[PDB]
Amino acid sequence: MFRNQYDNDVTVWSPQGRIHQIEYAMEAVKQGSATVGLKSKTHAVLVALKRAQSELAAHQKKILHVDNHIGISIAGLTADARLLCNFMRQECLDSRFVFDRPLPVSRLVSLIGSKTQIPTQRYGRRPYGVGLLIAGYDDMGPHIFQTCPSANYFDCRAMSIGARSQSARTYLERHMSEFMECNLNELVKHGLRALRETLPAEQDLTTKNVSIGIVGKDLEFTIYDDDDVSPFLEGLEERP
């Protein structure tokens, strides 16, 4: 009834000066499970809510190792995600090989931006319908980088993506002052509470559905699955 001529393909500009396909792909990342990334002065964390098709099903792997000093949390399409992960892993490996050096996060997100932008301008290649939270420690300091199918990228004290990210964004922007001077455990706790902000009241954070990915100056990027997250989870106060 309201079929739109100009959303058929990405190469098509609308008369309103918008790419409906890009907007829609950016709409897609919200389909995924919520994930939270935040940083202290010397630490950066990625807190994600993994979800399963069934109880027997183990859970999806939202958090991934790009390198020792960089990690990501995926939202949106997992295929597009795995492509990006392979590209980024190869780039970081190339940098270590050539320069004997860890890759800068700003540089990596820039490369991701170029790679993502390419499909937007080409007919028949759909955009990467994936949104990532890129977290790592470098010489400058800890960083949190958001990327979207639009191929735009940002730098954030903290950010949440996926379904119901907005409540977590509100808690995070409320307590962003506190996060900076926070120690590691407190920063993790803040991230966990923010992730809880997205959850429905029926759901409660558990060992299984929670995954914590954390990096530091003296600490490589790690991922904590079910038992490894339990100490961080136990301290968290009960929800209102």
């Binding site: 058929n8 829609y24 709409e27 897609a28 399963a52 069934s54 027997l56 183990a58 949106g76 997992t78």
Partner: protein, 229 residues
């Protein structure tokens, strides 16, 4: 069931405004039409079973194989026509042998299903696979959806009525389950969904254990099994 259709569907590489890829989601919906199969993961080992659906007596039963061997320590099951799967199967075999050649070590089931999903990307590809094998971690079961996503499952069913079997699997399954108890359980599920008397010709069963390699139960072994239940 009247015609339900939207403008945004039928596009292969177009995001809907909700963000969904409906064309491929529908394609996944068709891929699930295949024959029903069940896989049970236990400490003792992995039990895979599937319905044969032979047309005629003249057909050689061994000729149609709905369970295959990727490696000695690996078994795999597929739903739908074997031909779509054959490419993935060949890739899995050749990849595990690349791993053996290069590293003199046995490829993990997680790595194998990962590499197959890496093929699947590099169409919807119209096959659902249920990899089951033993590894250094232990017996494991990985379900690879026709989407290409792969996850570990304590138990899983694929095919025409995977969901209905899955609900039964939820009730029966427990961690203490033995491979023998799982086999008797899995046969019960296939009996219900098939709604036909189980016999050696209409199913194929296979198992993997730490002690032994992939072993497909011979006709005599299957006869001893179904007779027990």
């Amino acid at each position: 069931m009247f015609l339900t259709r939207s403008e945004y569907d039928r596009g292969v590489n177009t995001f809907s405004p909700e963000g969904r890829l409906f064309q491929v989601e529908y394609a996944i919906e068709a891929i699930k039409l295949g024959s029903t199969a069940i896989g049970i993961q236990t400490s003792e080992g992995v039990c895979l079973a599937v319905e044969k659906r032979i047309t005629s007596p003249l057909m050689e039963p061994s000729s149609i194989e709905k369970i295959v061997e990727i490696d000695a320590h690996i078994g795999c099951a597929m739903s739908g026509l074997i031909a779509d799967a054959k490419t993935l199967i060949d890739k899995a075999r050749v990849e595990t042998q690349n791993h053996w050649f290069t590293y003199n070590e046995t490829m993990t089931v997680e790595s194998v299903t990962q590499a197959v999903s890496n093929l699947a990307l590099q169409r919807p590809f119209g096959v659902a696979l249920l990899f089951g094998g033993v590894d250094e971690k232990g017996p494991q079961l990985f379900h690879m959806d026709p989407s290409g996503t792969f996850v570990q499952c304590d138990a899983r069913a694929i095919g025409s009525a995977s969901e209905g079997a899955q609900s039964s699997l939820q009730e029966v399954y427990h961690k203490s389950m033995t491979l023998k108890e799982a086999i008797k359980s899995s046969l019960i599920i296939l009996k219900q969904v098939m709604e036909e008397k189980l016999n050696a010709t209409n199913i194929e069963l296979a198992t993997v254990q730490p002690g032994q390699n992939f072993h497909m139960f011979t006709k005599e072994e299957l006869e001893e099994v179904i007779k027990d239940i």
